[PDB]
Design a protein around this ligand. Sequence first.
Ligand SMILES: [Zn+2]
Length: 284
Amino acid sequence: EPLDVVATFSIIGDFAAKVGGDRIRLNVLVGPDSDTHVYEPRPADAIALAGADVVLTNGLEFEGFLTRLIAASGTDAAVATLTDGVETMEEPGGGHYHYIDGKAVFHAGAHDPHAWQAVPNAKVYVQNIAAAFCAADAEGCAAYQANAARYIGELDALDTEIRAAIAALPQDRRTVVVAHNAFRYFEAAYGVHFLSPQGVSTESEAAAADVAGLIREIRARNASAIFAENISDTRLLEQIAREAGLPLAGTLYSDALSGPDGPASNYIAMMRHNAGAIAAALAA
Ligand SMILES: [Zn+2]
């Protein structure tokens, strides 16, 4: 019978649907245009995990509710951390932390969790999906591994596509500003710097003491355009676009897919909506 699979949010939900095919029954907890940083599960989510065979998660404390939800669900499921094997980036500030015991240990934690904004990282996510499906359903492993290997092929072409478009840009204009500091893996991969009022997580609200400072950094970096994000309320970025004298060029997709009929209804559509929107604005 089909593998009962729950993914914590929409993007890895797309990775799951792509590897699992018709062999799985997906149930995503955090939906399109929704924010996992501040998500807080409904009793249905405990029921889903208790009824699940595999739980797919991002790890690095993206899902702050995860450990409490597993406990309330009493689930027996294999929990996959799709970050395993990704070469992960430190949070900014401060920056972030070590602390020696007998020796020096990378502290708590932070690790920037947005590893998916770099397509080579998304391949590791997909690797880790199939391994988690092979583990719970030996009979389908050859199918899982063949879907993942095919999708990883399309991911590789997406990467070539993205780097090629950013390389064609004048290097003097590589700075944009978004809602929260969610695109640092995009920068490490492809070379667009990102400014934002909010930090790595959206839990803390953006204060007025950030705007004058951010406006100054936007000028010193000659940032080219301001984007809203699909998971945040756009009003503060319109204000910043005004005071900075910069166009509000559109909406980027950070931590969630769009709905269907939307422009980022799957990951590969998502990365190309962003790369093209970023590309067009910097060329202007
Ligand atoms: Zn985020």
